[PDB]
Amino acid sequence: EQSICQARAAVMVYDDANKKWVPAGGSTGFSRVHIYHHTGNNTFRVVGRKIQDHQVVINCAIPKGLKYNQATQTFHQWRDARQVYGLNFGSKEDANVFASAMMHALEVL
Numbered sequence: 001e002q003s004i005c006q007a008r009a010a011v012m013v014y015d016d017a018n019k020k021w022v023p024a025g026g027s028t029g030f031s032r033v034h035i036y037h038h039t040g041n042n043t044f045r046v047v048g049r050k051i052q053d054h055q056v057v058i059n060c061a062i063p064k065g066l067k068y069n070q071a072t073q074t075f076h077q078w079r080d081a082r083q084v085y086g087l088n089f090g091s092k093e094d095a096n097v098f099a100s101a102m103m104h105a106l107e108v109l
């Protein structure tokens with residue numbers, strides 16, 4: 001598996017019951033978020049690790065046809081059959097790096 005981008009973001013998951021964003025993995029803070037490319041079957045996953053303690057806070061597939069929503073220049077989100085994910089980027093450049101790679105992945109799936 002090959003990293004096609006690295007971006008700084010606080011990884012959030014939406015608490016449907018309480019209608020509130022909560023930190024992925026339970027601990028507030030920024031992570032290094034990759035998109036990893038598995039070339040063997042041309043699959044991509046979002047994998048993010050907290051800068052402080054290396055905890056994996058997100059590890060989710062990127063399916064063909066995903067709707068990736070750029071709500072703001074620093075807050076992007078998407079949904080799967082179970083959860084809603086949100087990335088609160090540390091900078092506009094980080095959001096741009098990540099969005100570029102996500103859009104690339106969705107084009108070649």
Ligand SMILES: CC(=O)N[C@@H](Cc1ccccc1Cl)C(=O)N1CCC[C@]12C=C[C@@H]1CC[C@@H](C(=O)N3CC[C@@H]4C=C[C@H]5CC[C@H](C(=O)O)N5C(=O)[C@H]43)N1C2=O
Binds near residue numbers: 078088
């Ligand atoms: C129908 C639907 O699911 N729509 C999604 C967006 C979306 C559109 C298209 C494809 C996928 C997605 Cl996830 C949607 O809007 N969702 C699902 C999570 C809850 C939310 C529905 C309503 C609210 C409106 C506010 C927005 C939201 O949560 N925002 C806007 C960007 C803003 C930026 C940062 C974060 C953290 C600070 C603040 C907060 O949560 O207090 N916040 C937000 O308020 C974020 N919201 C959402 O993101």
